[PDB]
Write a protein that binds this ligand. Structure first.
Ligand SMILES: NCc1cccc(Nc2nc(N[C@H]3CCCC[C@H]3C(=O)O)nc3ccccc23)c1
Length: 227
């Protein structure tokens, strides 16, 4: 996250770190007792590396009572995702067992009503992705509050030039923005999951290239079918 701040530890108990060979790779969101939602492009090329999900965490390196690494039984990329497109960029990870729930580990309710948010709704995005142009990686969870950007502005020739489908939404990216390492993580509006970060626009913090987030409500049947 460019332009953000240290999140309050454990205040986002749905927050997951998707790990490959023991390093943070992408964000994710605990959406059911045994399921984490993330981005398909995270695992596009993961081959036979070891995929794990860290729940209950603030710090990636320090021990914490609620922090537990889970193994993954199955990774379920959206069947219509492709490397090299921005569309359908969702991935469901089935944990090897149901997660132990508590104050620091809880699934987030997610949006099932397929209608847009009001423009300018302030939504929260969190992640362990890079935090400056040099590529610094934070040990602990960062977040930013971002206003939703209306799809027509987002689709301007100056902006993403028609690529924002009904299945996607935008948030402003003026210096505050999701970046590498934050894909898969949650965009939360009104206490409900609304979007999942995607890298479709790979640049970071350029206000003319808004953040793109995949709309969970648009994929409700798919999420239910996989659960
Ligand atoms: N603000 C939009 C946004 C949101 C999320 C990620 C990015 N940027 C970038 N993303 C990624 N990578 C994506 C896609 C592949 C899976 C890993 C992802 C991730 O780490 O988030 N690879 C990169 C390589 C060089 C420069 C920038 C970026 C940008």
């Amino acid at each position: 996250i460019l332009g953000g701040r240290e999140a309050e530890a454990h205040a986002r108990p749905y927050m997951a770190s998707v790990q490959l060979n023991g390093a943070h790779l992408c964000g994710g969101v605990l959406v059911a007792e045994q399921w984490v939602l993330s981005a398909a492009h995270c695992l596009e090329d993961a081959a036979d590396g070891k995929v794990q999900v860290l729940l209950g965490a603030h710090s990636l390196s320090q021990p914490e009572p609620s922090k537990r690494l889970y193994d993954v039984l199955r990774a379920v990329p959206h069947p219509d995702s492709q490397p090299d497109t921005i569309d359908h960029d969702l991935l469901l990870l089935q944990l090897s067992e149901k997660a132990t729930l508590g104050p620091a580990v809880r699934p987030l309710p997610w949006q099932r009503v397929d209608r847009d948010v009001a423009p300018g709704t302030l939504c929260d995005v969190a992640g362990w992705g890079i935090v400056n142009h040099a590529g610094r990686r934070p040990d602990s969870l960062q977040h930013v509050l971002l206003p939703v950007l209306d799809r027509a502005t987002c689709n301007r020739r100056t902006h993403h030039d028609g690529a924002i489908t009904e299945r996607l939404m935008c948030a402003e990216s003026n210096r505050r923005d999701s970046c590498k390492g934050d894909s898969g993580g949650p965009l939360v509006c009104g206490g409900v999951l609304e979007g999942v970060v995607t890298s479709g626009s790979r640049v970071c913090g350029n206000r003319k290239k808004p953040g793109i987030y995949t709309r969970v409500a648009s994929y409700a049947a798919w999420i239910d079918s996989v659960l």
